Amino acid sequence: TMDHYLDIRLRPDPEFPPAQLMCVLFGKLHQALVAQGGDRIGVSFPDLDESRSRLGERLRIHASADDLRALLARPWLEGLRDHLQFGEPAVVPHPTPYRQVSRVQAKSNPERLRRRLMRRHDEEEARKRLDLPFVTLRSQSTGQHFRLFIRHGPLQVTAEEGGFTCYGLSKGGFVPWF
RNA sequence: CUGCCGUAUAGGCAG
């Protein structure tokens, strides 16, 4: 169904490195996805460097002709349209391998894990008891900067039924990797 | 980072 996509490139900037730009971008897309609603908008990073742990300088936006045509018709790129080079929406080539672009979270800050352990079992007691490409974001509710880690899954011959979160990440859905 | 789910020092989530 999601046979349409659109690449967005981060135009080189003297003061802001690419990594910083992709952050802004991803945040922009997010705010617009919670506006669009639905779970049919995918996302991939074609320039993904699985070694250097860098997302790259390109954000591929997956969607159907209608869903995709509805997204970019919003003013979610006002702030950085001058920071972004992007063509028209085209149709994905085939045959194309499929993979998952999903968030990943590890367990750490035991001060945190233990605090929860205490809540669920009623500091001295508790105290006793990941290398991936990341985008850094800022929450709307509490003004905290958190690192959203992203991982591209092993290549598959097909795509299983699945949707996507308001960040365009895999909720179980697959995206064409090319 | 903060929190949620889960007996979990399993495995998962939310922003």
Q: In this structure, are A103 and A113 located in the same domain?
A: no
Residues in CB range of A60: below 8 A, 6 or more apart? A5, A6, A7, A8, A43, A44, A45, A46, A175
What is each CA distance from A135 to A65, A92, A130, A132, in whole angstroms? 27, 25, 14, 10
Residue A113's domain comprises 108-129
Q: In this structure, are A37 and A122 located in the same domain?
A: no
Q: In this structure, are A33 and A116 located in the same domain?
A: no
**CA A33 to CA A168: how far, in whole Å?**
7
Q: In this structure, are A113 and A103 located in the same domain?
A: no
Q: In this structure, are A81 and A143 located in the same domain?
A: yes
The CATH number linked to A40 is 3.30.70.2540
Q: Name which of A96, A92, A102 is nearest A156 in CA terms.
A: A96
The CATH number linked to A119 is 1.10.8.890
For the residues of A26-60, what is the DSSP string, one character each? HHHHHHHHHHH-SS--EEE-TT-BTTTTB--SEEE
Q: In this structure, are A87 and A173 located in the same domain?
A: yes
Q: In this structure, are A51 and A19 located in the same domain?
A: yes
- Measured to protein CB atoms, the chain B nucleotides within 7 Å are 1-9, 11-15
Q: In this structure, are A163 and A79 located in the same domain?
A: yes
Task: Specify the nucleotide whose C1' lies closest to residue A30 (CA).
Answer: B15
Contact A87, A32 (CB under 8 A): no
CA angle A178, A134, A154 (to 5 degrees): 40
Experimental method: X-ray
What is each CA distance from A113 to A109, A127, A144, in whole angstroms? 7, 10, 19
Place of tokens 């991936």: A132
Q: Which strand (E) or helix (H) includes residue A25?
A: helix A18-36
* Residue A31 Cβ under 7 A from any strand B atom: no
Please state the domain count of chain A: 2
Q: In this structure, are A82 and A170 located in the same domain?
A: yes
Q: In this structure, are A81 and A136 located in the same domain?
A: yes
Residues 87-106 of A with CB under 7 A from strand B: 102-103, 105
Q: In this structure, are A81 and A135 located in the same domain?
A: yes
Q: In this structure, are A41 and A116 located in the same domain?
A: no
**CA A67 to CA A56: how far, in whole Å?**
25
How buried is A23 (Cβ within 10 angstroms: 0-12 exposed, 13-18 middle, 19+ buried)?
Answer: buried
Residues in CB range of A55: below 8 A, 6 or more apart? A19, A22, A45, A47, A48, A133, A135, A150
- Both tokens assigned to A149: 């880690």
